[PDB]
């Protein structure tokens, strides 16, 4: 199965800058070359060039609405195209607002997809509930069908059509949810495993339940949107919104290892790696190494080891 790497050096989803350097940081570590060592054929689409919308005035509280809207519309088109050719899309973030385009485009070809969102946050604030107006904190609000019409049409997002229903997404890692967001996930009946559930059940039982919920009645494509801040800051410090008490390095790899084993991974997002936020050079190396390890894990690398078939190593 073919893999297509798509860089999304974008940071307008936040007031903070720097995450747009994430793709370069990941590639510098050799991510693309390492992926070619897996059983997958790899193609690099390169990094998309985003056109900045001049005089991009704030829509009420929402910041850079048109720029974020345009960037995501372009990304959706690219992902839709790669998905059409039967390849697995791998989006290298900037900010999580790019999930709007990534998931929307993926949904165009695979409308029955299931989303597994690993994040310390729900990123489900709407233009009306957000306290900051940062779109990187509102991706899911633009993707859910249940929230259509729950907020005013934001400039630059007219091309968007709610891809999935609240019943097709599972959150893992939650620990920093706004009151508005909490009201939304409870009201919509969204399935989630906050750190509380991870502590109670263990990551093993968590993945079992995640698959039974999403794949119990029907097997379908999986889109894994991974925000590096889902892991504890001691593992992924170079990120914009670190929150103590996160998933461990081991737990993160367990998630990707189990997803690989389903054979259903169809789209992947590796987001929020901000190279400019490490307190030291090493903190950046640590964050990048973790993101790279997670990506390779999603594509077959197992901690127990790997070896090529039809090869007599003895």
Is 133 assigned a ligand-binding role in the annotation? yes
Is 252 assigned a ligand-binding role in the annotation? no
Nearer to Mn ion, 227 or 251 (CB): 227
Residue of the chain from 21, 96, 175, 223 that contacts Mn ion (CB under 5 A): 96
Is 272 assigned a ligand-binding role in the annotation? yes
Residue of the chain from 227, 257, 258, 269 that contacts Mn ion (CB under 5 A): 227
User: How far is CA 210 from its chain centroid?
Assistant: 17
232 binds Mn ion (CB under 5 A): no
121 binds Mn ion (CB under 5 A): yes
119 binds Mn ion (CB under 5 A): yes
Nearer to Mn ion, 87 or 157 (CB): 157
Total site size for Mn ion, rule CB under 5 A: 7
Q: How far is the CB of 228 from Mn ion (least distance, A)?
A: 8
Residue of the chain from 47, 73, 181, 229 that contacts Mn ion (CB under 5 A): 229
Q: Which stretch binds Mn ion (CB under 5 A): 32-40, 53-61, 92-100, 125-133?
A: 92-100
Is 311 assigned a ligand-binding role in the annotation? no
Residue of the chain from 4, 47, 56, 123 that contacts Mn ion (CB under 5 A): 123
Q: How far is the CB of 251 from Mn ion (least distance, A)?
A: 16
Nearer to Mn ion, 7 or 93 (CB): 93
Q: Which residues bind Mn ion (CB under 5 A)?
A: 96, 119-121, 123, 227, 229
Mark the binding-site residues for substrate, compressed into ranges: 121-125, 132-134, 178, 241, 272
């Amino acid at each position: 199965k073919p893999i297509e790497i798509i860089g999304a050096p974008f940071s307008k989803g936040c007031p903070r800058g720097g995450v747009e350097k994430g793709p370069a940081a990941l590639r510098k570590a050799g991510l693309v070359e390492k992926l070619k060592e897996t059983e997958y054929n790899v193609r690099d689409h390169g990094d998309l060039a985003f056109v900045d919308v001049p005089n991009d005035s704030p829509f009420q509280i929402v910041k850079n609405p048109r720029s974020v809207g345009k960037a995501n519309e372009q990304l959706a088109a690219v992902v839709a195209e790669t998905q059409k050719n039967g390849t697995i899309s791998v989006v290298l973030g900037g900010d999580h607002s790019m999930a709007i385009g990534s998931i929307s485009g993926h949904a165009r070809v695979h409308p029955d997809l299931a989303v597994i969102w690993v994040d310390a946050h729900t990123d489900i604030n709407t233009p009306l509930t957000t306290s900051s107006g940062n779109l990187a904190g509102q991706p899911v609000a633009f993707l859910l069908k249940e929230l259509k019409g729950k907020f005013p049409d934001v400039p630059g997002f007219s091309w968007v059509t709610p891809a999935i229903s609240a019943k097709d997404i599972v959150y893992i890692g939650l620990r920093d949810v706004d009151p508005g967001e909490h009201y939304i996930i409870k009201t919509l009946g969204i399935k989630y495993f906050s750190m509380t559930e991870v502590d109670k059940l263990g990551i093993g039982k968590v993945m079992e339940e995640t698959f039974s919920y999403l794949l119990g009645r029907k097997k379908r494509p999986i889109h894994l949107s991974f925000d590096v801040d889902g892991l504890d800051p001691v593992f992924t410090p170079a990120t914009g919104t670190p929150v103590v008490g996160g998933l461990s390095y081991r737990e993160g790899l367990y998630i990707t290892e189990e997803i690989y084993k389903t054979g259903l991974l169809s789209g992947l997002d590796i987001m929020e790696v901000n190279p400019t936020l490490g307190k030291t050079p090493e903190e950046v190396t640590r964050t990048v190494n973790t993101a790279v390890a997670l990506t390779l894990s999603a594509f077959g690398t197992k901690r127990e080891g790997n070896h090529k078939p039809e090869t007599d190593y003895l």
